[PDB]
Paper text:
EhCoactosin, an actin-binding protein of the ADF/cofilin family, participates in actin dynamics, and here we report our studies of this protein using both structural and functional approaches. According to in vitro binding assays, full-length EhCoactosin binds both F- and G-actin. Instead of acting to depolymerize or severe F-actin, EhCoactosin directly stabilizes the polymer. When EhCoactosin was visualized in E. histolytica cells using either confocal imaging or total internal reflectance microscopy, it was found to colocalize with F-actin at phagocytic cups.
EhCoactosin consists of a central core of β-sheets surrounded by α-helices. The central β-sheets are flanked on both sides by a total of five helices; α1(9–17) and α3(92–107) are located on the N-terminal side, and α2(48–54), α4(120–122) and α5(125–137) are located on the C-terminal side. This arrangement of secondary structural elements is a common structural feature of proteins belonging to the ADF/cofilin family. The loop connecting strands β3 and β4, which has a conserved lysine at position 75, is called the “F-loop” and it is expected to participate in stabilizing and binding to F-actin. The N-terminal end and the F-loop are at two opposite sides of the globular structure suggesting that EhCoactosin binds G-actin and F-actin in very different ways. Although there is a general similarity of the overall conformation of EhCoactosin with that of related proteins in other organisms, the surface charge distributions of EhCoactosin is markedly distinctive. The N-terminal regions of the two proteins do deviate by up to 14.7 Å, with that of HCLP bent towards the inside of the structure while in EhCoactosin this N-terminal region is extended.
Residue numbers in the entry: 1 to 139
Amino acid sequence: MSGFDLSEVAGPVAEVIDDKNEEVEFVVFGVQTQPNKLVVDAKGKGGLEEVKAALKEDALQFAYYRTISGDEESKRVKFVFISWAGEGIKKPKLRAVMSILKGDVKNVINNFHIELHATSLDDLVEDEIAAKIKLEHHA
Ligand code: NA
């Protein structure tokens, strides 16, 4: 529905999910226009902090990472999906595409335990997301 090229998405998503690809635990995607396409902004080892480091105040981005949840045993792998619309984005037409683009992205990034929308780094706090995961686990 969005008109964006998502060709770059599936590969790295599979990398994050793949337990045997230990070199990739997160990915951050950025958004290019004319032509409208997602690209990889960052990808590697790490989690939330690494994602946060890659999120830009003037950008529309998406992120996806793996984390562990458990009390402990059973420790289980959980996946976090974040949409990001920085408070510095200059074009309100780009802000407006967020939800339709997000929907297309979630059809590729279909395996997640929590979804968060953030506009500030304060929206993304490890303990808060861990507690949310622990909650969705026992629902
Ligand atoms: Na991986």
